[PDB]
Amino acid sequence: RVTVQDAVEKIGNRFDLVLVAARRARQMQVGGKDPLVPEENDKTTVIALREIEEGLINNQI
Amino acid sequence: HARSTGSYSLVTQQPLGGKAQFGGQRFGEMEVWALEAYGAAYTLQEMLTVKSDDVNGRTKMYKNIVDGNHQMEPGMPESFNVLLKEIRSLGINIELEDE
Amino acid sequence: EEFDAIKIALASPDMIRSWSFGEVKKPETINYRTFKPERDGLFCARIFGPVKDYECLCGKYKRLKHRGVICEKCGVEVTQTKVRRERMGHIELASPTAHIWFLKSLPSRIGLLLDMPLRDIERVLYFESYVVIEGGMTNLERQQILTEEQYLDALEEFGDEFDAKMGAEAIQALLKSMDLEQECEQLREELNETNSETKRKKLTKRIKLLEAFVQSGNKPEWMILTVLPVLPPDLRPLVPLDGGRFATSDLNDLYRRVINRNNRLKRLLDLAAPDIIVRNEKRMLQEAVDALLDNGRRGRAITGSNKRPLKSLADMIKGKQGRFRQNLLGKRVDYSGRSVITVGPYLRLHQCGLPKKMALELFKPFIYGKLELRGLATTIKAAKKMVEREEAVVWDILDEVIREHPVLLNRAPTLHRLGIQAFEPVLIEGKAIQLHPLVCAAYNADFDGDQMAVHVPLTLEAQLEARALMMSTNNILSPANGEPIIVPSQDVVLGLYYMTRDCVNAKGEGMVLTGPKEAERLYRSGLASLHARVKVRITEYEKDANGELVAKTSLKDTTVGRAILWMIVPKGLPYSIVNQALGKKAISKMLNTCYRILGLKPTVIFADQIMYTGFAYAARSGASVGIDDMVIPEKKHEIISEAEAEVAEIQEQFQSGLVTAGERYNKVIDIWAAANDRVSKAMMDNLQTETVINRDGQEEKQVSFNSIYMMADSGARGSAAQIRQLAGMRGLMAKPDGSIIETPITANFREGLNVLQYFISTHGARKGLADTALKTANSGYLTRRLVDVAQDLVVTEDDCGTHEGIMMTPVIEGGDVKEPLRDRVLGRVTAEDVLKPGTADILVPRNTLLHEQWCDLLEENSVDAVKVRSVVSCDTDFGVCAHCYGRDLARGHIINKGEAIGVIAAQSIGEPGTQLTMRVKNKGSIKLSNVKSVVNSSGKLVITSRNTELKLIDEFGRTKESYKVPYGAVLAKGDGEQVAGGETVANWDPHTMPVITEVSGFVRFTDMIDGQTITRQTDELTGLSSLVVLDSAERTAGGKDLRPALKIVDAQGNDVLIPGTDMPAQYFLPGKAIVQLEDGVQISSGDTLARIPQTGGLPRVADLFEARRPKEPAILAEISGIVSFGKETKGKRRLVITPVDGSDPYEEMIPKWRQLNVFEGERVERGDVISDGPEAPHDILRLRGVHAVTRYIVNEVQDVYRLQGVKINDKHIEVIVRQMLRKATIVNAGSSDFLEGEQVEYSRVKIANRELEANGKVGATYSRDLLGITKASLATESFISAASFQETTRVLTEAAVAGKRDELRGLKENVIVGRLIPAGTGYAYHQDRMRRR
Amino acid sequence: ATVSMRDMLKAGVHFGHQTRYWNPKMKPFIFGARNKVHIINLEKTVPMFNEALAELNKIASRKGKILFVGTKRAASEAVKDAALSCDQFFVNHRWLGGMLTNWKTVRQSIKRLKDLETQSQDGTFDKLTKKEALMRTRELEKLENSLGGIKDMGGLPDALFVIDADHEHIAIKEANNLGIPVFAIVDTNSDPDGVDFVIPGNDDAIRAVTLYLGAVAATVREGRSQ
RNA sequence: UCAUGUUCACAUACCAAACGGCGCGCG
DNA sequence: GTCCTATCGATCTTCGGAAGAGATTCAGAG
DNA sequence: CTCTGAATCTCTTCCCGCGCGCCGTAGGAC
Ligand SMILES: [Mg+2]
Ligand SMILES: [Mg+2]
Ligand SMILES: [Mg+2]
Ligand SMILES: [Mg+2]
Ligand SMILES: [Zn+2]
Ligand SMILES: [Zn+2]
């Protein structure tokens, strides 16, 4: 997977999707949390985008 | 040709250019308008500081990459401090300001 | 140090000393055997700092324990050698010295402040004359340079009750003498002391300057140096080269000049030399510091080789090799590489292959970050070796590092955003970068050895930006126009054309099949030919009104290959898109409709499948090319043999003198055109004619499988203009000055050119190459000027709240519509509620985005004009609101708040900049514009108006043609008549301006005499004549002031009136005029009393945006009412406008040779056209307003792109206009604190007005004023961004005397200092920062 | 994220401890003594609670790391639930001495916990002998119980919301030493001097504890939403 | 039921290539 | 042969850029 | 007698990358 539009359906500003995907990927890489989506050893780059697909992320979290 | 890291010029710490020297490709003026025309701000910030010019940040970046931390500290490029001194070497007091 | 603004000012001497760590004394650098820096020279380690890493020069201390001790062997400080690049020193000059910049900027800041001419202060400063100060009880003035003769006078005509000095001390004294505020308080009153424009404005400059020196902290003496700072030595290093030689390191030769001169001047001062000697050395010193600051603004630049000028400081700041362009704005970067690109057909659209050698030499930091994480290497020290050895594990690690790390590929130049894109890499054995075929078109990457650079993004944020924004899958559309960029590659479309043709005879033709799959089994086993006709069962899918699929099924009649191709289409399109022989346009719309109906994610995969398919069937097609396939129509031989004799008919007339030398030529070239069209038509018919085949009995024809014709008819490559030359005829050719050749190239490249036809052919091609190589500079300088004016814009509000805007129509001109409304209006937002054609029924709410289903709806209606918001009208301060910008073309929805629209527009104009060159029809009814008219005695409607226009409306209710019709034309159809296509609507004199009467009656030559006003001609063709009325250039005031007249007359003394008119039917004659109607002729209504006989490619856009006035500026009328003459032509003519009410005495000097559209009696408006020629935007803005100048500029620029076939959305031009007219000029200061007249940024006055209006005090009023971009950028309110563009020594001194301050709003300044731009993702951060506030 | 007085009264926050176990430093925050049991003044409680809430909300909005300290076995479940509900960090079981002051050691402990947990779930090692697995499991369980909430906290907290200062006094002291703001609920027996944002109220009653937790959670969540 | 124990003596310690013309060439 | 000091303070910097705009110099006159 | 017109001078700008190739203070005095 690569095209992020379905995540942009959820974060309706596209800039906020980069700020949110970075924040969440940092909670994984740096903050030591782990994903609510099943990871496949993807990069956090892709995991965080795959966490928007589960519909369970916004910049409240 | 390809370069991870190697030489830097003396007057300003940007990379050398060449194959006869182990140089980095010029992310020249038009490319910067091209990034600005996407929303891409962090890419640009990196490309013209951490990857390029900030004498601290690039060594902190390198270590964060070998550590795999994927994070940067961006600072302020030393070529721009060259500019300030080259203006302040005219009787023109240019200075950074706070508020 | 963290910061958040930048400030610039003049440095007072004590500040310059403060920056110093020492004072340089000796003219030296490093020794010439050993290489220690020679102490108190320009490198002295105790002035600036130690050379060795963290250890001292005298050797006494070499350990961090001593950090910050200062020795007493030589005196150096032991500290970080890094600080050797940080610390300055200074020179104490033995005299004051003028700083060249302030002496020779645009004006002179020195001279202007003094009111003293530049040449005269220079006459002091290079010691040519004295200047007199404190003149006391003597007959001498306040500055008043006096020659050494004239001082030697005063030395004994007066004692010393005055003074005069020479050299920079004298200017310093003069500046010090400034009672600066009191001079300003006077001068701002002396402003009013005349109304003399020719100094009120350069005095407005002077009264500005004084108040700027007052309002800063600055003081005037600081224009004069006294301590000269010297650059920190590491910035000017004296590096050794090949053996024991220092690189000639220019500045150290300039400071060496200075310090030598200063050493001498201190000597000769203290040894007390006489005036003539010290004026020598003092001149040579001032003339040397001149070198050090800005070498070559002197009379001549100084040199140390074969006249190479030494690069001085100001040559290091400015322009194309200096910091702002060379090292700040864009700079070299690590983690990058380049290679020759080559095509990789198997890639999915998101990938590119890059060589394992490069990936391994690029990703090294990440590879170490896995070998430590495997614990397979101990650390960098081992992993480095383990990579160098290229051990068998490293690739399995690399193929984990890279496994999804986007890499950025961009060619250079990179005109537009699509020119950098990101791809996921896949590894390759070779050394080329394997690029995806469809994407090469975006780059204008041809595959003929065209290198491309690659960059790795390092951080997590740089990967998230690359994947979300720049990945090729996200960019199927152009930024500039709603049109795909994935537009199929020529071979792909060749294959799909070949796959979908029908051939009327084929193997397996006419059977009936149950689906594509057995269509494929039928093809692949070789049982049916791919273009054989067939019937199949099909199924297709549609998404309903909710969006959910309905699946349907039927028999379809089709071909095997259209059945196979249907299998690639995603399940939601109708088969009617495939059921046709496909070609480049037809498949682009195919792909577009996929995006219309499904969306992106299916479209990128469908595009990939198209690519694979086209390649594979294009292979099987074996679509070769071969010389037996070039088809010559044998009629060509007859067509020449016919046309040759008809040209010789034109020649035989010429051989009898029976036709003119112009006519012979300009007709012969039309006979060759008539042959050429016939050869081309016969050849295209022959190509289609070559295929005919037996339909099992009797022959029948079908579309030709001829190799070159597939390629043309498919749109793969080489349409009509090429095949015409390959096998038709090459045709007419042009000379160097563009004038046409009398005997064309009747040959074609299937056959030979002889030597002359070939030699003339090169006059074409070498012109076309010279154009390419010459243009590629000016196009780039155009895009630079544009982004560097647009970069201040960012979309920054959702809806600014306007109800204002502009009106869109089809562009109706030259008859028919050159663009429909659906091009202009699609995806803007409505300005105001859009009604049903008719009345009172609204159709679109007042701020609705007119997306496609709304624009199709408008096309269902008889709408002609629609009002929409445009960025030129959006009342957001410091930006634009999103709704006013409208659709984001690369996304189709409304723009996102924060997007950098300015930069997108400038690139969108510049990308096609290489494609320019640097060198009644249908039945309808009459509608009219401005056309006040009368009927003649035959009853025919004759036009009496001169901004007259014609419109034609088709009976289904929409306007569809327009024309401009002269004054005194007759409307052959008037009175709302309907007319057939091509039924001649009007007639006019093609050669002269006519003058005609409203009344009928007798006439006289009133107030006229022969020889005084008219010439008693014979007219040689007849002997019975029409008289020549005298020109004001051929006759005196006794003829000029006797202005000739033709009043219609009756013994009543006045004519029968028009109701409510006092005016008699008095009429008049201009110069050159021809008059047949002498005294006592009875004149009818409509009779002509008399008759009066009478651009580029790219530059015509570059000079449009720079708003340069043309050579031939049409004189446009002003205010209103009626014209009159002023006083007649000598030196020039002067003419007048006088209103219905108010100021009658407006008069204007007017050129004689531009013939006038009015004479004396004509009703006129601000903006009516008094001569022909092109307009000038400065005046349009003054006379029809900002909306009218937008409409002008958008039209008159698109008329260049539409001519050359290029497409650009109109909004990307308004975004430049929005910037062109950002400045305003104060007419009333009202109660506001601007100067009583001032130029200001328009937002600044507007924001002051809105609050002052809320205070109810009198707001200011102004005109907006249109600067061309090359100036409207230098007038940005923020010196860094302007100074880094051009004219650096202007901006960087004008801003410096003002003491100006920069808040670093906008983009280019934040790039220079290297922080997040306040755009896009970085806008959203600046916004959150500004909201939590 | 304010709380109503009727709701507080209904919960039973006004109830305190016996009058003999009171702190005279809590004598200002006391209304009366009904049946030899102190009643906390809710009139003074609500504004204080609101002020604390506002500060917490601001911290959350600026992405502050709140740490919810609650060790009473009745309130341990509730505090843990609240913390995770508002994606924050908590300590529901015994506060380890020097969790914050001796952060570099408790950091090593967290690393150990993370490694053990990762091995348990993601490792899929299988080679456990039963003995090794049992030992590893015991270690994992103990670590999870003690440090499970702060495992993802990474560094030190920017604010410490604490249920009952007298019971969790060690934590209060540690926070004071470091200079981290404390927002403590303080019953009549507790001492309020170490606390920066005293919120008088019943630490004992479960409903009251839930109410305090829920309100705090709401305010932090609001800050996150921003 | 269980008394006594000669004298004097205790050590460590503050390091990996730089900048400008002139050209030719690629795009 | 090496070290130190200075430049055409007894010539001649190239005509083959256009432009395009400003600063700065001059008309016909009230 | 200098005021708005116009007239001659200088200053400033001229694509982006890239790769080679070479060539790199002098003269005089002690
Ligand atoms: Mg090419
Ligand atoms: Mg004894
Ligand atoms: Mg004893
Ligand atoms: Mg002893
Ligand atoms: Zn020392
Ligand atoms: Zn707007």
Side-chain angles (χ1 to χ4, degrees), chain C residues 1173-1190:
Chain C
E1175 297 79 9
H1178 303 281
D1179 295 309
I1180 307 176
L1181 177 59
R1182 188 167 63 93
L1183 297 168
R1184 300 192 171 279
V1186 54
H1187 308 293
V1189 67
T1190 301

Side-chain angles (χ1 to χ4, degrees), chain C residues 37 168 367 388 417 486 502 602 683 777 840 857 866 954 992 1048 1084:
Chain C
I367 296 167
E388 190 291 321
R417 39 181 277 178
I486 313 302
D502 58 329
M683 189 272 298
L857 169 160
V866 174
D954 294 21
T992 83
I1048 304 304
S1084 175

Side-chain angles (χ1 to χ4, degrees), chain C residues 798-802 869-870 873-876 880-885:
Chain C
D798 192 50
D799 165 19
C800 67
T802 182
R869 282 152 60 147
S870 165
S873 71
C874 180
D875 59 1
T876 289
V880 170
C881 76
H883 288 217
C884 284
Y885 183 85

